[PDB]
Structures are given as C-alpha cells and as structure tokens.
Amino acid sequence: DELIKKLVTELAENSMIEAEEVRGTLGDISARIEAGFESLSALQVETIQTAQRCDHSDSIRILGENIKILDRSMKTMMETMKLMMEKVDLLYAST
Amino acid sequence: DELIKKLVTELAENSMIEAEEVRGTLGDISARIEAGFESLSALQVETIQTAQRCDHSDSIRILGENIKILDRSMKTMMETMKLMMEKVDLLYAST
Amino acid sequence: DELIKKLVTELAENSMIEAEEVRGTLGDISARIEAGFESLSALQVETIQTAQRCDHSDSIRILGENIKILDRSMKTMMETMKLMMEKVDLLYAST
Amino acid sequence: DELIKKLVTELAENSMIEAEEVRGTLGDISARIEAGFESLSALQVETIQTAQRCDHSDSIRILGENIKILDRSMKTMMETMKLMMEKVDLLYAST
C-alpha cells in the first residue's frame, strides 16, 4: 500500500477544494435563513403591537354608558315637562 | 478486478466522511427551516387572534341605535314644549 | 487508456449513489421552503382580511354627525325654553 | 508522477459535472429563500399599514367629549326647567 496511499492523498487534495466551496455555499444559505426569519419576526411583532392599539373595548363601553346616562336624563326631563304642564292645566281651569 | 476493488474501498473510506459532514449540515439547515416556519406561524396566529379584538361592528351599531333613540326622544320633547307653549298663549289671551 | 476508462466507470458507479441521495435531500429541503412560504402567506392574507374589518372610519363619523345633530336640537330647545319663560314673565307682570 | 496526474484530470473531468449540477441546485434554493422572504415581508408591511387605519383613539375621544357637552347642556336645561316651574308655582299662588 505504498503507491496506493500516494494516490489517495493526491485525490483528496483536489476534492477538498470542492468540499470547502460547498461548505461556504451552505453557510451562505444558512445565514440567509436566520436573517429572513430574524427580520420577518421583528416586523411580525411590530404588527401585533400595532393591532393592540385598535382594541377600543373600554372606550366604546364608556361612550355607551354615557349615552344611557343621557337617555335617563331625558326620561327625568320628560317627567318634569308633564309635571309643568299639569300645573299649567290647573292654572287655565282656575280662571 | 482484485486490486481494482481494493482501491474502490480505500477511496470510498475517505469520501464517506465528507458525505456524512454534508448530510449533517443539510439536516442542520432543514431543522432551521422547520423551526423558523413553526415560530413565525405561531406569532402570525397570535396576530389574527389580536386583530379580531378590534372588530367593534356590533358595539358601534348599539351606540348608533341609542343615539337615534335620544334623537326620537328629543323630537317627542319638542312636541311637548310647543304643546306647553300653546297652553301658555291661551292663558295670556284669557286675561 | 483501456484500463484507465474501466476505473473511471467503477468510481462513478459508487459516487452516483451518493449524488442521488444528496439530490433527494436537496429536493426535500426545497419542498419544505415552498411549503412554509405557501402556508405562512395564506395565514398572512387572512391577517390583512381580518384587519380590514376593524376600520370603522365611516361608522364612527356617522355617530359623530348624529351627536352634533342632537347638540343642534339641544340649542333649538334652549331657545324654545327661554321663549316659554319670556311669556311666563309677561303673564306674572299682567296680574 | 507522469501517469498519476493523467488519472487526476480524467477523474476531475467527471466530478466537475456533478459539482456544477449541485451548485446550480443550491442557487435555485437560495433564490427561492430570497423570493419568499421578499414576498412575505411585503405582505407583512401591507398588514401593518392596514392595522394603522383601525386606531380610532382620537375619533372615539371626540365622540366622548361631545357626549359630555350634551350631558352639560342637559344639566343647563334641567336648571332652566325648575326655574320655569318656580315661576308657575308663584303664578298659581297669586290667584
């Protein structure tokens, strides 16, 4: 195995160059994977944080509650109007 | 083919190591693909679930409906005011 | 080049198997890329379509416009009240 | 090393073809990575821009403020009604 091992090395010497170029190419691809995923997920988090600003559950409830306060104040006023009119009716009949 | 097959094995013995290292590298890349896609999609689902909380179609409709109830109560009161005034006008002329 | 070409084939015969297994592995990776991107983008479109349901620009404007109608009706009523009172003042002084 | 180098070239000649086909396949994969990431991120930006249209913080505040103006106008009217009634009471007792 004297001449055999000399040919084993001279063949590895030429393949090792093509193995290095594939390894670098694979690492270039791996770097583009971890860069796309790191970028999109940061943009994705920015989407969730933005969406949260549009949840107006409490704001709309407070508007709703204050419309019902006004409705109750309108009932209170309708009772005060009929009360005033029932005094006016008495004033007319007192002539 | 006695010596031929001895050189075929001694060459496979040295290439098999470089094939294993490429296979492991490919599997490292494949694992990063299924990890990025599993993570981003989970973050993406969290975005849809968050966006749904901002659909206030029904809340805003109930506010709108109760503003129109108040508007109708305001028409009812305007008729009651003119009614009261038309009794006051009669009371003035009765002097 | 008689014996040379016989060794060229017996070496290609053993490498061709390792080339096929890498080609299949590469295609397995390529298929996972086009599957993740096809899935996430479909989920992403579902996010945009969901977000559109939360744009209540017109609904909120119609609420705003009808609150200002009520405000104008309240001004109309305040003028009718002072009008009624200015008739009541005259009725008191007519005694 | 006369015959040795002739076999080194005739072996590189057959491997160089399989190296080119792997290089093209790797580049086909790399192109699908930069295409998916470029597409999804453009769709992701469209999601953020859409979500911003649903932030009605200011619109809802102006509705809230104008409901409280109406509430204050309703208090002003309740004072004017009791004022009118306190003149009507005096008119009844003046008989």
Contacts of C33 (CB under 8 A, 6+ apart): B33, D29, D32, D33, D36
Six token digits for residue D18: 């399989």
Chain B positions contacting chain D at CB under 8 Å are 47, 51, 54, 63
**In Å, what is the CA distance from C74 to each residue of B26, B71, D72?**
75, 10, 11
Cα torsion A11, A17, A20, A25: sign:
negative
| Chain D partners within 8 Å of A69 (Cβ) | 71
Residues C33, D40 contacting (CB under 8 angstroms): no
Rounded to 5 degrees, what are φ and ψ at B49? -60, -35
Domain boundaries, chain D: 1-55, 57-95
Q: Do B60 and A55 touch (CB under 8 A)?
A: no
**Helix%, strand%, coil% for chain D, nearest 5:** 95, 0, 5
**For C95, which of D14, D44, D94 is closest by C-beta distance?**
D94
Name the residue of chain D whose CA is nearest to A40's CA: D41
Expressed in angstroms, the distance from the first to the final Cα of chain B is 141
Return the CA Rg of chain B: 42
d(CA C76, CA C72): 6
Nearest to D72 by CA among C70, A70, B88: A70
Measured between CA atoms, how close is C21 to chain D, in angstroms? 12
Q: For C29, name the nearest residue in chain B, comparing CA atoms only.
A: B30
Are residues A79 and D84 in contact, defined by beta-carbon separation less than 8 angstroms? no
Resolution, given in Å to one decimal, reads 2.8
**What is the experimental method?**
X-ray
Phi-psi region of C55 (alpha: psi -120 to 50; beta: other; left: phi over 0): beta
Please, is B1 exposed, middle or buried when counting C-beta atoms within 10 Å of its C-beta (0-12, 13-18, 19+)? exposed
Is there a contact between C77 and B82 if contact means CB atoms under 8 Å apart? no
